[PDB]
Design a protein around this ligand. Structure first.
Ligand SMILES: CC(C)C(NC(=O)[C@H](C)NC(=O)OCc1ccccc1)C(=O)N[C@@H](Cc1ccccc1)[C@@H](O)[C@H](O)[C@H](Cc1ccccc1)NC(=O)[C@@H](NC(=O)[C@H](C)NC(=O)OCc1ccccc1)C(C)C
Ligand SMILES: O=C(O)c1ccc2c(CN3CCOCC3)c[nH]c2c1
Lengths: 99, 99
């Protein structure tokens, strides 16, 4: 699709059989989910943002379907009020910015 | 312009007759720039991101050009690590996501 930005660009995603929604976020290097139970052991990892820095949980090789497009990569579990799809997955679905 | 997302979607902007660089950020509701003097009155405002909240100065009706597209709107100024163009100005330049 072609998504305008008058509201937040939330899209439906599918991850481990569950439907969730998430934000297509060109300002995120990484993909970050709030709760999602991803299976097994995770690596600790730091990320930053406008407020400063926070510890999150890194899981690798995670399959998310985004609007029907399959993407496999790293997914962080962290304190975000919304699920965030970052550039690491946006690139794999062929997502571009256009004006 | 079509912009891919294998690296950060950084672009040249002009604001108060200065060239700067700033991140096209579809996950930001608002536009936040590094401290600079802008014309007219500001009001205090707080905004939230990763690692918490920061205090910014809000200016209204600021002219900004993004790759030669004029936009006029609200620009927040404060201790951001990166200049951010959010949805409030991305819609004005006709910026869309496409996959
Ligand atoms: C999600 C993060 C991984 C993302 N960070 C990155 O990609 C960073 C730079 N990469 C990174 O950490 O790489 C690893 C590394 C290791 C450490 C040192 C350096 C590098 C991020 O904070 N990116 C943001 C832009 C950014 C880029 C670089 C530096 C600083 C800011 C927005 O795209 C992204 O959309 C966030 C998502 C966000 C929303 C809400 C709170 C938590 C996360 N929006 C924002 O930070 C802004 N918020 C908003 O647009 C509206 C106002 N806020 C909001 O609704 O807040 C609600 C609220 C706040 C607090 C708690 C509860 C809810 C802001 C730019 C205006
Ligand atoms: O530039 C400043 O001197 C300045 C000083 C104070 C604030 C505040 C205080 N607030 C406003 C919103 O509610 C909570 C706290 C925000 N920006 C600010 C900027």
């Amino acid at each position: 699709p072609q998504i305008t930005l008058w509201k937040r660009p939330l899209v439906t995603i599918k991850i481990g059989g569950q439907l969730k929604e998430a934000l297509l976020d060109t300002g995120a290097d990484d993909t970050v989910l709030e709760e999602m139970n991803l299976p097994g052991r995770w690596k600790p990892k730091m990320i930053g943002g406008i407020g400063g820095f926070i510890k999150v949980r890194q899981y690798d090789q995670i399959l998310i379907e985004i609007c029907g497009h399959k993407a496999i990569g790293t997914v962080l579990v962290g304190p975000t009020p919304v699920n965030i799809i970052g550039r690491n997955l946006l690139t794999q679905i062929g997502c571009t910015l256009n004006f």
